[PDB]
Design a protein around this ligand. Structure first.
Ligand code: CLA
Ligand code: CLA
Ligand code: CLA
Ligand code: CLA
Ligand code: CLA
Ligand code: CLA
Ligand code: CLA
Ligand code: CLA
Ligand code: CLA
Ligand SMILES: CCCCCCCCCCCCCCCC(=O)OC[C@H](COP(=O)(O)OC[C@@H](O)CO)OC(=O)CCCCCCCCCCCCCCC
Lengths: 90, 34, 80, 159, 73, 62, 742, 141
């Protein structure tokens, strides 16, 4: 009937976890082993940020450089004649 | 334009990658208590 | 963290402490005006900058002055 | 069925309600059985699952409506854009983990259940936990984008 | 927007936006470090003046260049 | 200090009534009062009050 | 129980309280020390519930003020009728309503303004009016200036009468609080008596005078040869010449054999093919039905005659599981607080004004109304603005009630309490949906603009590129188009010509109405309308809910409804009251209504109006460029603002010169508003000191000390000037365009 | 005077609200207010809505200090009820704040020290141009 206490302070501050599934294992052990041996080295954040930046740099480089003529419009260039200057300029 | 392959190399490396890395560096420097 | 000050012109109107909605200003014995009362700001760590204090002192210019300084959680009035 | 609205955990002095939307048997079951709320499972597996789901769903709004949605490279451009989005999100997750988590703090996660049972906090709110989550999410997103592209623009069963 | 409306509205809006962020599942795993607050008073005046000035400069630079160079006198 | 009902002109540099005149009401003659003179003016200030107390060395022109 | 209650002579009429300017409130009755007394005098001149505290005097003052307002409205109406009688080309208009421009105002020749009296036709010279009074008088059966003169006098009489009542019921016989509180009998009498008998009387007037006169006007006879409106009352045979059903006397009505009244009591959709308006034989039937509807609906609530409902047992009976204690304690709210009634009344009246503005343009009820484009546009814009103002007023008064009339000691009745107890959820979700709507409405326009700017129109959101056809509106149109065959077997035609069904109707050249198409350009603008309305509701509802308290200021109700700010503390608390939320919502209401009226103007000039020629070819005014050019903001800039604004700007030296002048005048007023909207009181109060110094130097110091406007009056002045400038600019632009090109 | 000590008194009847505690109350300070009433009335909550206080002792925990002072002023003015409120830390360290010496800050009291009191008129502080490269501001002197 009382909603305060100094001992159980977490009961009187709303620190409960409203949705907690304490299940320790949900997937196939073989599949988990085959997933952690491949996505395990990606844990090192210090060696992942400097990997992502270089990957993205080289990716937008190769794709930015080795593009296609039909795909891009700024790469296909002008294929017509230029209009003239309103005051007889070029 | 002599090269004409450099504008395809630099503006992707200066309007996309440069902000992407400097914003991350500055966010790490801002949100740290030392 | 704001800085409250009480200069020696308070006539002991007690309105400053009645108005402050944070229990910051309190009365104190100090002879000299009429009734040996003066204001005092011991709990400046709780002032938000309401300036309700200054809007009450009926002195010539003022006798209680709030100077807005470093901002904190208590002074910002946050509840989240 | 009498009065379906209740305060949180029967405590009126917290900011919310136990409406049929938040608190309900079906809703609580569906929300507890999500990988981000399964507590004891290792963060890497949850990250893998979540990245798989997200990378698999993301190929849609990129291929159907793109700048090259009317070419022979229809699906490839959208798949590449999806992979770019997932690596960008991986970078954001990494910088969030660096800025928000320390390598000495035990856990910021809640520890109690809905009835005050002294359970254990989620290991996801650790620095290494978030690092594993980010790696698993990167891998899952890439694999999901690749699988979506394989199913769409390599095989049969159009939609 | 920054010169007509003042802070006490935006702070009382952010105070419920923060509630809405805290009381939702699947999105309270993330968490802000810096408490979100409304822009200050002088800061609001500064941002408003900056927007006003940038717009004032741009919509006239564009006009003076287009109306002239499009005719060249 | 000055007499009752005397018209004195203020010299307090941070007063709304600086260089203005006002008639004394009643100067308190206690031993330790720092601003005993009480003067009422015929024009309110930004706050709306018209009475204020000064020290005898802070206002006199007759 | 229910009886007459009056207190004989509660206030002696005199001039004593008249000589003392401030008398209602004791705080400012003393006198003007500073110059912020002249201002708040007029500010709280009408704050009846602020001067005193008893509901009785407040109610009496409210009653007498209503009577004064009615007197002013009567003077206005009598003036309009007298002008239509004395300085109007009405009789000439009646002989040729398709070539004579209406006009009921002339200008004295003094300083060259004589040229405002343009050549409107019929040998007349005056400003061309757009009130639509000529069409109303033609539909009423008025056919001579004499018949106007009299009614003018009539109005004047009522004016005096109203004034008399206004004095009487405050000074000789004023009621007491217990009399006003009888809401059951009040609603009984407003339903059965005011609306029911009023509709019945107007149906009588229609069926007796307005039908034969208008029918003879449609048969092409001279408006002077038409018999007078009483030759059809004292001669049933002269009236039966048109509707022979009258030959059957009043017998069909009493033997329930009144299916023989199908001559003048019809049910036919569409418009009259020669006047471009509804069939008066249909509006007579409509009013006859509405009258009996309201009459039988005026017997619901209980009086001292035993039977009837009571609007307290009705309320408490509705109390469900989800919603606490139901509607309990609301009958106590709406009978002991004038503000909680004004809120509902203003909201409903504003919404009703919007409904009226939407109905009248689509079903023109007056002859030659759809033809005159200027009148049909003004009647839309004016009513839209009125409704937009009234809804914001409703919000403001709900906030006032919540601030100083609500109390919890009786409001444990968990309906208002429950909605007050999840405001942090209501406002959060409204904020999210506002953001979602804003993005998915305006970002589409920005997309279209960027694409059409990048030379790639194939990626736009046009009707040729990716399409956004509104399917639900099209389905509703197709459903109403087929109603007179399946879901309305007795109605001969659809209710309106705007539905996809039907065909075109002409009124001698210019077109009246036709089926309106709906494409992507309409989808986008409808979503924009929804977004702006949602933002306005967000601001107003946030103000109303947080009028009492919030996390920032838990004791805001102690400060009051109207106050600038609670200090520069807590980071800053400027514009934190409900008055400031109304201040902020006025601008968004202005935005919304301006977008609506722009939509209507362009869509009508582009896809509805025009002038058809023989063989059927119809060319709209702009040329149907709304479906393609309204998908980009640049299109609204050039094809609507730049293009259509080309009539007002070059109107100098013509009869449309005043519009060209008021264009720039309203621009100046709008820009003037920014001085008050951007600045603040401290700078001006300081600057005023350096002027008071120069005044003292020359002994011209006023005794009323010149203080600067309060922090709230600055905002009030700013928003007032802003709204005046904007609305007057749009007024001048719309009129100068449509008068010349319509 | 010995500051009053907290207890486990009951709480007022309230159906809930969305203006209650937040995460700030479990990682930082939070406040709790108590009082004594002679009957069962209906009082307005400083967080929105109404609640029926109980007879005898009542205890209410809020999220700020200004909320407690607002509610307490409303009590002392409308119901004539005396009250106190504390501040509780995450680690359960109660701190007694408002009636620090029993008497409210309006009435004078012996054994009170003056803080922030300057022995001069406000218009006498030195300019901010002599105390430069010296962090004394203008008024701490
Ligand atoms: C401040 C001077 C300045 C500015 C505004 C620009 C602007 C531009 N250059 Mg550029 N450039 C400059 C100096 C400058 N250049 C110099 C000195 C060189 C010789 C090394 C070049 C060589 C160069 C190449 C080879 C190319 C450009 C290109 C471009 C365009 C795309 C941006 C880009 O890729 O930059 C890339 C910039 C560099 C690779 C070198 C930067 C040069 C100096 C060191 C930067 C100056 C620092 C600056 C003052 C500090 C800014 C502070 C600010 C953030 C507050 C853009 C119009 C591209 C283009 O033509 O696209 C159409 C392109 O391909 N630039
Ligand atoms: C405009 C957005 C958009 C678009 C164009 C698509 C487009 C597509 N989705 Mg998709 N999807 C979307 C949003 C979208 N989705 C969202 C928001 C979700 C919820 C996460 C999904 C969940 C989803 C699933 C679960 C599946 C698709 C599948 C598909 C493909 C076949 C249908 C098609 C490419 C199917 C697919 O590609 O399977 C091979 C499939 O299985 N979608
Ligand atoms: C909100 C407004 C809006 C919208 C809807 C679009 C839409 C679009 N833009 Mg666009 N644009 C906009 C504003 C907008 N624009 C603005 C303001 C600008 C100027 C800054 C531009 C500039 C621009 C350019 C320059 C280009 C586009 C392009 C495009 C197209 C592809 C974009 C893409 O890959 O999206 C991918 C979308 C996603 C990855 C996310 C999809 C969102 C998902 C479906 C939400 C699902 C929520 C879900 C239902 C919630 C329920 C959950 C439950 C199941 C549990 C698409 C039609 C491109 C184009 O060529 O178009 C033809 C292009 O090149 N835009
Ligand atoms: C026969 C003449 C007469 C006389 C001598 C009085 C005398 C009095 N009346 Mg009274 N009254 C009268 C007629 C009269 N009344 C009528 C006809 C009405 C019905 C409308 C009222 C309704 C009325 C009310 C409701 C109240 C009074 C009150 C009063 C007392 C104070 C009035 C005062 O100082 O305000 C003088 C006010 C004015 C001079 C303002 C006049 C403005 C008029 C009414 C409206 C004009 C609008 C006009 C169209 C302009 C529109 C805008 C324009 C700029 C474009 C005083 C005893 C008040 C009272 O006793 O309360 C203590 C009070 O509350 N009277
Ligand atoms: C809201 C109602 C209203 C409005 C706006 C006007 C406005 C006007 N009236 Mg008017 N009038 C009104 C009611 C009104 N009246 C009533 C009720 C009557 C009957 C008593 C009259 C009888 C009247 C006459 C007889 C004349 C005007 C005239 C005028 C115009 C010049 C008035 C002036 O300068 O003095 C002006 C446009 C004068 C005018 O237009 O001169 C050509 C003029 O001669 N009015
Ligand atoms: C939604 C429409 C509606 C509904 C549900 C009711 C329902 C009711 N009316 Mg009612 N009424 C209505 C419209 C309605 N009325 C209208 C439009 C008028 C006019 C009346 C006039 C009316 C009278 C005069 C009386 C009722 C009464 C009643 C009650 C007894 C009737 C019965 O069940 O037999 C019942 C609760 C009777 C009663 O005692 O109600 C308390 C009664 O004497 N009604
Ligand atoms: C049924 C209609 C109605 C009624 C009866 C009331 C009644 C009231 N309102 Mg209200 N209101 C309404 C509609 C209504 N309002 C609408 C539609 C809005 C939205 C804009 C508001 C917004 C509003 C606010 C924001 C406030 C009120 C207040 C009040 C109260 C005092 C009003 C007063 O003294 O004004 C005195 C009248 C004036 C000072 C006149 C001001 C001049 C106006 C602004 C300019 C008119 C321009 C004109 C059309 C043309 C200009 C050009 C010409 C002048 C040359 C009073 C109970 C006040 C209050 O505290 O309530 C208790 C308050 O603060 N109302
Ligand atoms: C043109 C000026 C302007 C604009 C754009 C806004 C915009 C907004 N106001 Mg607003 N306001 C203004 C003037 C303006 N205001 C003025 C003058 C006033 C004084 C009366 C107000 C008063 C006011 C109030 C009182 C309220 C708002 C609210 C809002 C928001 C509504 C949510 C929404 O639709 O989001 C949609 C946002 C947009 C359409 C902005 C454009 C976004 C573009 C299309 C996307 C760009 C793409 C990408 C992000 C660009 C990246 C750039 C990077 C690469 C460098 C929105 C941010 C409401 C709010 O907060 O609700 C949330 C609210 O309550 N305003
Ligand atoms: C079209 C709009 C408009 C107009 C007509 C004015 C008119 C004026 N302003 Mg002004 N002002 C405006 C917009 C406008 N302002 C805006 C948008 C701002 C920015 C907030 C200001 C800021 C401003 C200041 C700061 C001052 C003026 C002053 C003045 C006055 C100068 C004397 C004069 O020219 O006569 C005059 C009344 C001056 C004044 O008071 O004159 C003595 C002054 O000190 N104004
Ligand atoms: C729409 C929902 C609807 O059908 O309401 C139905 C429900 C009303 O149910 P009750 O039977 O409690 O209410 C009937 C009466 O008690 C008066 O409402 O309303 C709510 O639960 C609150 C609505 C919030 C809606 C959230 C959005």
């Amino acid at each position: 009937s009382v909603y305060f206490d100094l001992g159980e302070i977490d009961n009187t501050t709303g620190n409960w976890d409203l949705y907690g599934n304490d299940d320790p294992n949900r997937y196939n052990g073989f599949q988990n082993k085959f997933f952690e041996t491949f996505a395990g080295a990606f844990t090192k954040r210090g060696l992942l940020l400097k990997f992502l930046v270089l990957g993205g740099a080289t990716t937008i480089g190769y794709l930015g450089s080795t593009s296609s003529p039909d795909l891009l419009a700024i790469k296909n260039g002008p294929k017509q004649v230029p209009v003239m200057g309103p005051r007889g300029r070029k | 334009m002599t090269a004409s392959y450099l504008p395809s190399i630099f503006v992707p490396l200066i309007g996309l990658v440069f902000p992407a890395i400097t914003m991350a560096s500055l966010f790490i420097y801002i949100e740290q208590d030392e | 963290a704001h800085s409250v000050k009480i200069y020696d012109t308070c006539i002991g109107c007690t309105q400053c402490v009645r108005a402050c909605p944070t229990d910051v200003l309190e009365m104190v014995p100090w002879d000299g005006c009429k009734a040996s009362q003066i204001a005092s700001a011991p709990r400046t760590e709780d002032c938000v900058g309401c300036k309700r204090c200054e809007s009450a002192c009926p002195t010539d210019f003022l006798s209680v002055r709030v100077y807005l300084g470093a901002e904190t959680t208590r002074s910002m009035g946050l509840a989240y | 069925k009498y009065q379906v609205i209740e305060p949180l955990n029967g405590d009126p002095f917290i900011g919310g309600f136990e409406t049929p939307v938040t608190s309900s048997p079906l809703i609580a079951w569906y929300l507890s059985n999500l990988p981000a709320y399964r507590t004891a499972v290792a963060p890497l597996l949850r990250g893998v699952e979540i990245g798989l789901a997200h990378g698999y769903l993301l190929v849609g709004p990129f291929v159907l409506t793109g700048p090259l949605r009317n070419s022979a490279v229809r699906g490839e451009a959208g798949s590449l854009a999806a992979a770019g989005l997932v690596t960008i999100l991986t970078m954001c997750l990494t910088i969030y983990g660096i800025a928000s988590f320390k390598e000495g703090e035990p856990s910021k996660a809640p520890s109690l259940t809905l009835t005050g049972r002294q359970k254990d906090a989620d290991k996801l709110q650790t620095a290494e936990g978030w690092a594993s989550f980010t790696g698993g999410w990167f891998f899952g997103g890439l694999s999901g984008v690749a699988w979506a592209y394989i199913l769409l623009y390599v095989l049969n069963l159009p939609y | 927007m920054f010169l007509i409306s003042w802070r006490g509205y935006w702070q009382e809006l952010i105070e419920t936006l923060a509630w809405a962020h805290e009381r939702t599942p699947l999105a309270n795993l993330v968490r802000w470090k810096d408490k979100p607050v409304a822009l200050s008073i002088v800061q609001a005046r500064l941002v408003g003046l900056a927007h006003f000035s940038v717009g004032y400069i741009f919509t006239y630079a564009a006009f003076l260049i287009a109306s002239t160079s499009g005719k060249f006198g | 200090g000055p007499k009752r009902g005397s018209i004195v002109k203020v010299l307090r540099r941070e007063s709304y009534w600086f260089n203005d005149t006002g008639k004394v009401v009643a100067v308190d003659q206690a031993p330790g009062v720092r601003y005993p003179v009480v003067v009422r003016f015929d024009k309110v200030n930004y706050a709306g009050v018209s009475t204020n107390n000064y020290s005898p060395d802070e206002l006199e022109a007759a | 129980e229910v009886k007459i209650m009056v207190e004989k002579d509660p206030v002696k009429t005199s001039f004593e309280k008249w000589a003392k300017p401030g008398h209602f409130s004791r705080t400012l009755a003393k006198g003007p020390n500073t110059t912020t007394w002249i201002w708040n005098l007029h500010a709280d001149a009408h704050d009846f519930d602020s001067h005193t505290n008893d509901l009785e005097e407040i109610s009496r003052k409210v009653f007498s003020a209503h009577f004064g307002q009615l007197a002013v409205i009567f003077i206005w109406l009598s003036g309009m009728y007298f002008h239509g009688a004395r300085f109007s080309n009405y009789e000439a208009w009646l002989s040729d309503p398709t070539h004579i421009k209406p006009s009921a105002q002339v200008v004295w020749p003094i300083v060259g303004q004589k040229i405002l009296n343009g050549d409107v036709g019929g040998g007349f010279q005056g400003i061309q009016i757009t009130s639509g009074f000529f069409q109303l008088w033609r539909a009423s059966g008025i056919t001579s200036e004499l018949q106007l003169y009299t009614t003018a006098i009539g109005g004047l009489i009522f004016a005096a009468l109203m004034l008399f009542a206004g004095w009487f019921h405050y000074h000789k016989a004023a009621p007491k609080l217990a009399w006003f509180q009888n809401v059951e009998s009040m609603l009984n009498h407003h339903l059965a008596g005011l609306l029911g008998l009023g509709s019945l009387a107007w149906a009588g007037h229609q069926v007796h005078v307005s039908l034969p006169i208008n029918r003879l006007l449609d048969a092409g006879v001279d408006p002077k040869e038409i018999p007078l409106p009483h030759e059809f009352i004292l001669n049933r045979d002269l009236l039966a010449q048109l509707y022979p059903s009258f030959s059957k006397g009043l017998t069909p009505f009493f033997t329930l054999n009144w299916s023989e009244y199908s001559d003048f009591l019809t049910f036919r959709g569409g418009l009259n093919p020669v006047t471009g308006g509804l069939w008066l034989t249909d509006t007579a039937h409509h009013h006859l039905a509405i009258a009996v509807l309201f009459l039988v609906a005026g017997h619901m609530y209980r009086t001292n005659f035993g039977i009837g409902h009571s609007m307290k047992e009705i309320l408490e009976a509705h109390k469900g599981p989800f919603t606490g204690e139901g509607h309990k304690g609301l009958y106590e709210i709406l009978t002991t607080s004038w503000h909680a009634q004004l809120a509902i009344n203003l909201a409903m009246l504003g919404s009703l004004t919007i409904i009226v503005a939407h109905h009248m343009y689509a079903m023109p009820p007056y002859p030659y109304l759809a033809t005159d484009y200027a009148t049909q546009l003004s009647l839309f814009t004016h009513h839209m603005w009125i409704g937009g103002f009234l809804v914001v007023g409703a919000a403001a008064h709900a906030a006032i009630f919540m601030v100083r009339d609500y109390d919890p000691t009786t409001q444990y009745n968990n309906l208002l309490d429950r909605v007050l107890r999840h405001r942090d959820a209501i406002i959060s979700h409204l904020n999210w949906v506002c953001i979602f709507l804003g993005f998915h409405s305006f970002g589409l326009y920005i997309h279209n603009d960027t694409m059409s700017a990048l030379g790639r129109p194939q990626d736009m959101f046009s009707d040729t590129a990716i399409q956004l056809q509104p399917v639900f509106a099209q389905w509703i149109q197709n459903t109403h188009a087929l109603a007179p065959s399946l879901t309305a077997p007795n109605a001969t035609a659809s209710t309106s010509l705007t539905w996809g069904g039907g065909d075109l109707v002409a009124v001698g050249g210019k077109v009246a109405l036709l089926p309106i198409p709906l494409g992507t350009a309409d989808f986008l603008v409808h979503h924009i309308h929804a977004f702006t309305i949602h933002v306005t509701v967000l601001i107003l509802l946030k103000g109303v809910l947080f009028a009492r308290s919030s996390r920032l200021i838990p004791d805001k109700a102690n400060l009051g409804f109207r106050f600038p700010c609670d200090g520069p503390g807590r980071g800053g608390t400027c514009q934190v009251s409900a008055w400031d939320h109304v201040f902020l919502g006025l601008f968004w209401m202005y935005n919304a209504i301006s977008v609506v009226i722009f939509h209507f103007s362009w869509k009508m000039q582009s896809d509805v109006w025009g002038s058809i020629s023989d063989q059927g070819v119809v060319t709209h005014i702009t040329g149907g460029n709304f479906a393609q050019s309204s998908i980009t903001i640049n299109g609204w800039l050039r094809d609507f603002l730049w293009a259509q604004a080309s009539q007002v700007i070059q109107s100098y030296g013509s009869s449309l010169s005043a519009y060209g002048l008021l264009f720039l005048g309203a621009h100046f007023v709008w820009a003037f508003s920014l001085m008050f909207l951007f600045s603040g009181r401290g700078y001006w109060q300081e600057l005023i000191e350096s002027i008071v110094w120069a005044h003292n130097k020359l002994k011209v110091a006023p005794a009323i000390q010149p203080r600067a406007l309060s922090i709230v009056q600055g905002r009030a002045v700013g928003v007032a000037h802003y709204l005046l400038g904007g609305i007057a600019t749009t007024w001048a632009f719309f009129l100068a365009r449509i008068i010349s090109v319509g | 005077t010995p500051p009053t000590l907290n207890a486990d008194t009951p709480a007022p009847i309230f159906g809930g609200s969305t203006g209650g505690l937040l995460r700030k109350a479990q990682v930082e300070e939070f406040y709790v207010i108590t009082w004594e009433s002679p009957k069962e009335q209906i009082f307005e909550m400083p967080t929105g809505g109404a609640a029926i206080m109980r007879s005898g002792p009542n205890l209410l925990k809020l999220a700020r200090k200004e909320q407690c002072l607002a509610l307490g002023a409303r009590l002392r003015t409308k119901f004539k009820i005396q009250y106190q409120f504390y501040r509780v830390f995450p680690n359960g360290e109660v701190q007694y704040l408002h009636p620090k010496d029993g008497v409210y800050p309006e009435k004078v009291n012996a054994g009170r020290s003056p803080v922030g009191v300057n022995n001069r008129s406000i218009g006498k502080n030195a300019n901010p141009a002599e105390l430069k490269f010296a962090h004394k501001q203008a008024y701490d002197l």
